[PDB]
Design a protein around this ligand. Sequence first.
Ligand SMILES: [Ca+2]
Length: 279
Amino acid sequence: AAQTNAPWGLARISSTSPGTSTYYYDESAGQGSCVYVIDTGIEASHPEFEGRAQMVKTYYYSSRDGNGHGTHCAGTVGSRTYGVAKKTQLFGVKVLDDNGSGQYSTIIAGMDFVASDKNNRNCPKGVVASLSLGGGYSSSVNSAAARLQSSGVMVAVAAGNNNADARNYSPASEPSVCTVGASDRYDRRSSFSNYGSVLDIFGPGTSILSTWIGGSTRSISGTSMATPHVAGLAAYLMTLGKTTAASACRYIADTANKGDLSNIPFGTVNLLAYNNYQA
Ligand SMILES: [Ca+2]
């Protein structure tokens, strides 16, 4: 399949070169997979989700996304126009309030929730979780992410937006999950993107158009935006039978565009998420 005039990040993920504008992908499009978006929620009523999104959990007085950032991330995973995996099922877990903040104990509860909740969902092709969040180093936060991964979920987490070594942030610093840095449309490391040995992969993160609340759309930037490209890619690859939750991060790294990003500090992977789709 070909989507013309796609957001640059989608075009990038299906290309051996920057500077193109068509997204190419297998028509299966993540059908039969599921992606949990652990964030501020998802506006499931957005036409872009086509009924494939649902809120499954909140820790607050509402499950509504009163912020937008969860909706944006979910859009990059699986919206019809702005998404990588256009036929995946999206499940929202609201661990962040409408200011985009969340206590680590709530975030941890959300991760353990997903590990159980997948057993209540139909995801024959596999399960992914996208965590566009983080804070300072916490062994408990890392351990929760590790459990989620161990339970059979492909966990993709943001590296962070500190232009610093991600070793000092959680869940970014958890070795067993897929830690995602951000790049721009010119294949530069995004200026805010964290880096370091703990990174596994880069995805498009600067000036990413996606869904927003009130049935709208929005371009924003962050490792928060790169993460759902990788989460959506994992779901897409799992539907194709190319990989599984336990090795999707490895598979993505092994099939990535290599050595093509600029301003990657010595010791950080130079790997850009790539679907290796041949039309
Ligand atoms: Ca790893």
